[PDB]
Amino acid sequence: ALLSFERKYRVPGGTLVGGNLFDFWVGPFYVGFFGVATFFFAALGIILIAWSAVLQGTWNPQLISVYPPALEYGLGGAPLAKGGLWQIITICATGAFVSWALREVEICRKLGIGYHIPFAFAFAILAYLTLVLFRPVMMGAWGYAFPYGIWTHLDWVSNTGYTYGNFHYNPAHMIAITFFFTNALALALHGALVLSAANPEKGKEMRTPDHEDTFFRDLVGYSIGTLGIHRLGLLLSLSAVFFSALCMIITGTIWFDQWVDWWQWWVKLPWWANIPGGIN
Amino acid sequence: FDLASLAIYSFWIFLAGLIYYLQTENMREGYPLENEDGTPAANQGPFPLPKPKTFILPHGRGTLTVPGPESEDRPIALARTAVSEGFPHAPTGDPMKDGVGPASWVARRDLPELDGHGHNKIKPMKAAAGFHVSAGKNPIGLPVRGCDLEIAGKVVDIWVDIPEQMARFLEVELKDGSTRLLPMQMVKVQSNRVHVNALSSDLFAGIPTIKSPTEVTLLEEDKICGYVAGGLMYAAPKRK
Amino acid sequence: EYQNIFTQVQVRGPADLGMTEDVNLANRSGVGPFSTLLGWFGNAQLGPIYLGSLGVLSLFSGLMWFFTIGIWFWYQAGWNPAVFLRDLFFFSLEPPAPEYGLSFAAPLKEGGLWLIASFFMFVAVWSWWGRTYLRAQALGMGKHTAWAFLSAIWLWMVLGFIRPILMGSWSEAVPYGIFSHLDWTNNFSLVHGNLHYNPFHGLSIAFLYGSALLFAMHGATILAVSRFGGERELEQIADRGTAAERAALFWRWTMGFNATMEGIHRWAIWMAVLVTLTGGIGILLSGTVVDNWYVWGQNH
Ligand code: BCL
Ligand code: BCL
Ligand code: BCL
Ligand SMILES: CC[C@H]1c2cc3[nH]c4c(c3C)C(=O)[C@H](C(=O)OC)c4c3nc(cc4[nH]c(cc(n2)[C@@H]1C)c(C(C)=O)c4C)[C@@H](C)[C@@H]3CCC(=O)OC/C=C(\C)CCC[C@H](C)CCC[C@H](C)CCCC(C)C
Ligand SMILES: COC1=C(OC)C(=O)C(C/C=C(\C)CC/C=C(\C)CC/C=C(\C)CC/C=C(\C)CC/C=C(\C)CC/C=C(\C)CCC=C(C)C)=C(C)C1=O
Ligand SMILES: COC(C)(C)C(=O)C/C=C(\C)CC/C=C(\C)CC/C=C(\C)CCCC/C(C)=C/CC[C@H](C)CC/C=C(\C)CCC=C(C)C
Ligand SMILES: CCCCCCCC/C=C\CCCCCCCC(=O)OC[C@H](O)CO
Ligand SMILES: CCCCCCCCCCCC[N+](C)(C)[O-]
Numbered sequence: 171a172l173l174s175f176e177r178k179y180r181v182p183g184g185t186l187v188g189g190n191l192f193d194f195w196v197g198p199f200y201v202g203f204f205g206v207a208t209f210f211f212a213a214l215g216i217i218l219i220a221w222s223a224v225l226q227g228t229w230n231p232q233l234i235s236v237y238p239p240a241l242e243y244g245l246g247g248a249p250l251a252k253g254g255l256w257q258i259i260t261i262c263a264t265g266a267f268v269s270w271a272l273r274e275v276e277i278c279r280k281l282g283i284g285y286h287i288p289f290a291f292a293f294a295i296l297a298y299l300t301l302v303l304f305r306p307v308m309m310g311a312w313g314y315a316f317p318y319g320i321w322t323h324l325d326w327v328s329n330t331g332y333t334y335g336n337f338h339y340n341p342a343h344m345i346a347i348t349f350f351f352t353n354a355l356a357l358a359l360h361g362a363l364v365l366s367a368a369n370p371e372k373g374k375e376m377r378t379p380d381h382e383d384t385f386f387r388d389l390v391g392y393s394i395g396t397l398g399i400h401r402l403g404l405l406l407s408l409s410a411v412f413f414s415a416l417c418m419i420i421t422g423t424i425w426f427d428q429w430v431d432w433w434q435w436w437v438k439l440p441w442w443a444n445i446p447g448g449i450n
Numbered sequence: 451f452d453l454a455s456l457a458i459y460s461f462w463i464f465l466a467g468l469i470y471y472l473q474t475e476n477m478r479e480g481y482p483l484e485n486e487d488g489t490p491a492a493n494q495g496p497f498p499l500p501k502p503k504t505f506i507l508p509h510g511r512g513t514l515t516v517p518g519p520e521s522e523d524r525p526i527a528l529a530r531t532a533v534s535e536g537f538p539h540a541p542t543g544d545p546m547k548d549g550v551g552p553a554s555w556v557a558r559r560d561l562p563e564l565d566g567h568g569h570n571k572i573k574p575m576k577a578a579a580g581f582h583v584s585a586g587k588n589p590i591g592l593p594v595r596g597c598d599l600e601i602a603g604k605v606v607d608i609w610v611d612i613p614e615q616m617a618r619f620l621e622v623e624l625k626d627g628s629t630r631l632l633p634m635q636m637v638k639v640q641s642n643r644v645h646v647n648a649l650s651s652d653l654f655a656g657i658p659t660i661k662s663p664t665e666v667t668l669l670e671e672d673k674i675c676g677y678v679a680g681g682l683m684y685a686a687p688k689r690k
Numbered sequence: 691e692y693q694n695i696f697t698q699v700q701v702r703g704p705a706d707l708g709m710t711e712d713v714n715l716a717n718r719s720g721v722g723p724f725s726t727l728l729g730w731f732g733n734a735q736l737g738p739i740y741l742g743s744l745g746v747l748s749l750f751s752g753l754m755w756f757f758t759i760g761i762w763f764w765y766q767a768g769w770n771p772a773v774f775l776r777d778l779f780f781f782s783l784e785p786p787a788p789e790y791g792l793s794f795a796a797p798l799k800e801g802g803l804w805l806i807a808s809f810f811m812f813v814a815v816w817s818w819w820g821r822t823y824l825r826a827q828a829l830g831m832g833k834h835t836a837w838a839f840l841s842a843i844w845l846w847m848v849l850g851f852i853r854p855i856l857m858g859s860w861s862e863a864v865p866y867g868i869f870s871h872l873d874w875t876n877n878f879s880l881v882h883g884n885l886h887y888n889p890f891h892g893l894s895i896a897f898l899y900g901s902a903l904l905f906a907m908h909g910a911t912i913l914a915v916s917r918f919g920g921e922r923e924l925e926q927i928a929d930r931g932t933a934a935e936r937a938a939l940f941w942r943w944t945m946g947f948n949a950t951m952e953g954i955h956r957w958a959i960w961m962a963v964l965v966t967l968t969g970g971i972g973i974l975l976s977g978t979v980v981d982n983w984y985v986w987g988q989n990h
């Protein structure tokens with residue numbers, strides 16, 4: 171079925187591969203070549219997850235956990251039950267995420283819009299490959315990647331974090347957090363502002379964007395604008411994910427001590443490093 | 451059992467209702483679903499259509515109630531490719547002129563969008579007292595070049611969003627004297643020229659014209675912006 | 691191709707003094723200078739700002755909280771400027787010890803000063819909340835901003851007021867210090883048996899991640915249809931244009947469903963408030979109802 175205004179947009183063209191072979195829809199979903207690719211990687215990835223569940227001996231989704239190979243395996247291949255499945259599943263996931271992005275690009279072309287959406291989705295992919303590929307490779311073993319399990323992958327975060335004391339002191343980790351917090355702050359303010367204008371007090375007529383500007387100037391003395399906030403939110407969210415990959419690619423590769431030690435270059439400067447008193 | 455287990459169960463119930471509400475709220479436009487022949491689709495999904503809601507538009511411009519009887523209010527120059535559903539609909543004529551596909555436009559109101567005081571939100575800079583170029587390259591006077599590397603005209607004015615103080619269109623004087631509006635988001639202002647990758651020099655004339663030299667209506671904006679974005683797909687043959 | 695991330699050409703006109711409605715114009719400042727810097731990304735106009743009784747009260751009360759923490763840091767620094775900068779992030783104004791319970795009789799150097807600072811912060815935040823309500827009311831707009839703000843206040847209130855009172859000790863509150871309040875966060879989890887296994891903590895993360903997910907989707911979407919004026923969302927709500935249609939159809943063809951121009955901002959406001967809404971609940975239950983989230987998790 172279509173939306174009332176959808177038909178005029180369902181024209182042929184815009185594909186990158188296969189011409190008009192896969193240029194059609196299944197219900198709402200647009201297929202395309204990379205839609206077939208996505209379905210293929212996805213289906214194969216899930217099969218291997220189900221397969222790992224059989225080898226594990228449980229079908230409870232909260233216990234299934236596909237572990238990577240042991241550190242002793244380095245960056246070589248491992249048998250399916252000893253980490254090979256994690257390796258193949260990782261390949262599938264990567265193929266699915268990428269295919270999903272290229273499918274979005276085909277949709278951008280057929281609608282004549284920009285490519286901002288798949289470009290932003292690539293940041294998320296980057297962060298995934300940072301944890302499962304870039305960082306393990308730089309450290310010399312797939313075992314450093316995280317396990318595919320609902321709860322076992324949280325323990326990996328806790329184990330990996332506490333290997334370096336309190337991960338909070340990772341300076342790149344602070345910056346990323348700041349963008350995540352600031353982002354949710356900006357997202358709440360933006361949604362509230364549009365709704366407050368489109369849904370004014372009772373007995374009031376719908377507000378204008380000038381009211382939005384005026385509200386935020388009255389509140390904090392500056393309005394970024396209807397275009398600037400969407401730019402801002404795109405940049406707060408991508409920057410949050412950027413410094414997240416950054417704060418991990420450096421951990422265990424160029425930094426090995428506890429992250430609180432990284433802050434000693436400020437404490438211990440030979441001039442004030444000896445002045446008695448204070449915390450230090 | 452305990453106060454924690456009850457709180458987490460109460461929340462999941464609350465969240466299921468919230469998704470329900472959020473989803474029905476996002477069905478006030480474009481629903482009910484249609485078959486490709488315009489008739490209502492048998493399968494409308496598990497979420498029901500929301501109950502109408504009314505906006506009182508400012509400046510005495512009526513009231514919008516959504517959802518309501520939908521209508522394109524314009525002819526669509528497309529024909530089916532297949533008996534079965536889910537396949538493209540091919541343009542029957544010129545898609546850029548017929549305004550279909552990436553060249554689509556919505557039959558919005560033939561009235562300019564107004565600011566909070568009732569004045570035209572978008573005005574040419576030559577009619578905007580005090581406005582000027584404060585930073586960046588001033589494109590006025592520069593030649594406008596299409597994707598075929600031919601010159602189609604020169605910039606003669608900028609249409610600005612006054613309440614936002616933002617350039618929205620370039621007014622380009624064609625070789626025949628007339629002018630056309632170019633979305634600011636589709637042009638590339640350079641040191642010596644303005645380059646439009648979306649259209650070829652001989653496709654600028656096809657850009658829909660406006661009926662008043664000092665104002666542009668919402669309908670005209672949609673026709674202008676659609677046509678230009680449609681060039682990316684339909685003007686590609688002669689794109690160097 | 692042009693991406694519309696930074697303005698290509700800036701235009702400047704007479705300053706926009708803003709809508710009047712029922713705003714008391716006596717409390718509006720003059721217009722500030724234009725910032726060509728900010729013009730590349732957003733609007734270049736600074737001001738005017740509204741400064742009433744709540745604004746003054748909040749601003750003054752806020753500066754007292756800042757100054758109360760300040761003199762304490764200088765005191766820990768031995769009044770030495772060099773030591774002050776060296777150990778700036780390590781200074782901390784801690785709440786009273788557990789032995790004082792919920793009493794205010796703690797001397798200034800054993801948490802009494804923390805209680806004073808917390809008072810000024812309480813008056814600053816709540817007077818600022820009342821500010822976001824009256825500014826919306828003066829212009830005739832809905833109170834979505836004020837209600838969205840409460841969700842943040844909820845977690846803030848739990849962390850240093852509601853939960854300590856239920857625990858029966860101000861020592862359960864968070865300290866004022868850059869690194870100290872990070873350490874307090876770390877110990878809070880260890881004491882309560884791993885907050886990863888607090889379900890309201892996991893939900894809070896899902897909405898934090900979900901906020902970055904949604905805003906990247908929405909920001910990217912609006913820039914992708916800015917070539918159709920998509921960022922003018924209020925008029926796209928009143929009169930659907932090709933911008934809103936292409937934006938909706940992109941996500942329909944991608945993941946099977948879509949939003950409207952208005953509806954997406956209800957997804958947004960809820961995705962964001964649920965962060966601090968679920969979070970405040972998780973913390974409130976920690977220690978009052980559940981002492982160990984991991985152990986509590988194994989029975990459920
Ligand atoms: C005990 C644990 C340690 C700690 C150790 C770590 C470690 C270790 C790591 C982090 C990382 C992060 N930490 Mg830390 N951290 C702690 C405390 C905190 C606190 C806090 C308040 O205390 C905060 C706010 C944070 C915040 C964060 C973020 C900056 C970051 C995670 C987001 C991210 O990278 O997303 C990026 C997003 C993704 C990776 C998702 C990608 C999704 C893919 C592309 C698509 C999925 C498709 C899906 C399968 C399809 C299914 C379809 C279905 C229909 C749904 N940490 C403590 C001190 N932290 C992580 C990081 O930076 O990672 C890069 C990380 O590895
Ligand atoms: C990002 C930094 C760390 C990390 C740290 C944490 C921490 C810490 C927490 C989570 C939490 C979650 N993480 Mg994790 N997580 C990482 C990488 C991943 C990846 C990935 C492919 O890279 C995935 C798919 C997930 C998935 C998930 C969900 C089970 C859950 C909620 C996330 C959410 O709503 O996000 C925002 C996304 C959306 C709102 C969209 C909907 C997405 C849904 C929820 C994803 C379902 C995935 C499904 C269970 C697995 C794939 C299914 C396949 C078909 C087989 N994590 C890395 C290693 N993650 C929280 C939790 O409760 O865990 C139990 C939690 O507390
Ligand atoms: C060792 C550390 C622990 C841990 C301990 C905690 C604790 C403890 C807490 C969190 C909390 C949070 N954690 Mg955790 N967390 C860990 C691991 C993680 C990981 C991860 C990848 O492993 C992630 C992604 C997270 C993520 C998160 C967030 C979802 C959540 C914060 C909500 C928020 O927006 O707060 C930021 C927003 C606020 C604090 C609101 C404040 C609003 C106030 C009113 C504004 C003040 C204005 C001020 C006065 C003005 C200053 C200056 C201005 C210029 C005027 N945690 C591990 C397991 N985490 C919180 C939570 O809710 O948990 C359920 C919390 O309290
Ligand atoms: C980069 C900024 C933020 C962001 C942006 C972002 N995400 C995006 C997009 C954008 C712009 C999309 O356009 C795209 C989309 O379509 O969203 C609706 C997407 C998307 N972000 C998603 C999830 C997601 N994003 C996240 C984060 C973020 N996304 C960032 C914070 C997170 C987390 C953990 O924070 C998650 C969970 C998806 C809903 C969607 C992409 C869907 C996709 O790629 O589909 C193809 C793949 C499949 C259908 C399934 C493949 C299955 C595999 C073969 C096997 C399983 C692999 C996996 C390793 C299992 C591990 C599970 C355990 C860890 C529990
Ligand atoms: C302003 O303009 C905007 C809109 O319009 C006006 C919008 O509509 C949206 C979209 C946003 C929403 C609808 C909000 C809700 C979304 C959330 C919370 C994100 C989280 C999303 C989800 C949890 C859903 C994820 C969905 C999927 C992963 C899809 C499932 C995949 C399937 C079924 C397979 C894909 C199919 C194919 C590849 C084709 C089939 C292939 C064959 C071979 C048969 C945004 C951002 C926007 O700015
Ligand atoms: C030159 O420098 C000078 C001296 C000028 C300075 O001023 C320098 C000063 C600074 C640099 C200060 C820097 C500030 C910080 C490092 C503070 C950092 C703050 C945090 C990490 C946030 C912690 C806040 C969390 C808490 C614990 C909040 C408590 C709020 C409560 C809800 C209020 C509780 C109320 C109480 C106890 C009673 C009040 C009365 C009632 C009726 C409720
Ligand atoms: C230079 C003085 C400014 C002081 C700043 C105070 C601190 C705010 C911090 C973070 C939140 C981000 C704010 C931006 C969110 C704006 C919400 C929105 O949607 O604004 C669109 C536009 O303003 C409607 O016309
Ligand atoms: C389809 C492109 C995929 C590129 C990156 C995929 C990540 C693979 C990680 C596991 C590799 C296992 N290996 C090479 C030992 O078989």
Ligand SMILES: CCCCCCCCCCCC[N+](C)(C)[O-]
Pocket residue numbers: 267268271272275285286288289292295296
């Ligand atoms: C190699 C990192 C991951 C690559 C995955 C592919 C992402 C989709 C392509 C982005 C489309 C946007 N743009 C402007 C590049 O065309």
Ligand SMILES: CCCCCCCCCCCC[N+](C)(C)[O-]
Pocket residue numbers: 453456457460461464967971
């Ligand atoms: C028995 C304890 C029940 C606790 C319930 C917790 C979840 C309810 C959340 C509802 C929030 C509604 N509200 C008012 C913020 O819109």
Ligand SMILES: CCCCCCCCCCCC[N+](C)(C)[O-]
Pocket residue numbers: 463464465466467468471
């Ligand atoms: C399936 C039972 C659902 C019970 C919980 C109902 C959730 C209400 C959702 C909030 C309504 C939105 N509103 C009107 C407050 O903006």
Ligand SMILES: CCCCCCCCCCCC[N+](C)(C)[O-]
Pocket residue numbers: 198469473494495496497946947
């Ligand atoms: C976190 C995402 C929330 C779940 C998504 C809910 C979408 C359900 C509605 C899909 C049906 C839409 N349809 C076919 C009627 O147009």
Ligand SMILES: CCCCCCCCCCCC[N+](C)(C)[O-]
Pocket residue numbers: 370831832833834837838840841844959963967
């Ligand atoms: C704990 C507070 C969280 C609830 C926030 C939900 C915001 C949506 C409701 C806005 C209602 C605005 N109104 C009608 C009063 O103007």
Ligand SMILES: CCCCCCCCCCCC[N+](C)(C)[O-]
Pocket residue numbers: 889890892893896900957960961964
């Ligand atoms: C407002 C959008 C709603 C999105 C809902 C996303 C649900 C994420 C589920 C995370 C699982 C949390 N838990 C309780 C298992 O720890």
Ligand SMILES: CCCCCCCCCCCC[N+](C)(C)[O-]
Pocket residue numbers: 197198945946947
């Ligand atoms: C987090 C998992 C839930 C997300 C599911 C999203 C819904 C998929 C598309 C629904 C519409 C499909 N349908 C019914 C038209 O065939």
Ligand SMILES: [Cl-]
Pocket residue numbers: 740741742743744745746821
């Ligand atoms: Cl005020």
Ligand SMILES: [Fe+3]
Pocket residue numbers: 360364400908912923955
């Ligand atoms: Fe928006």
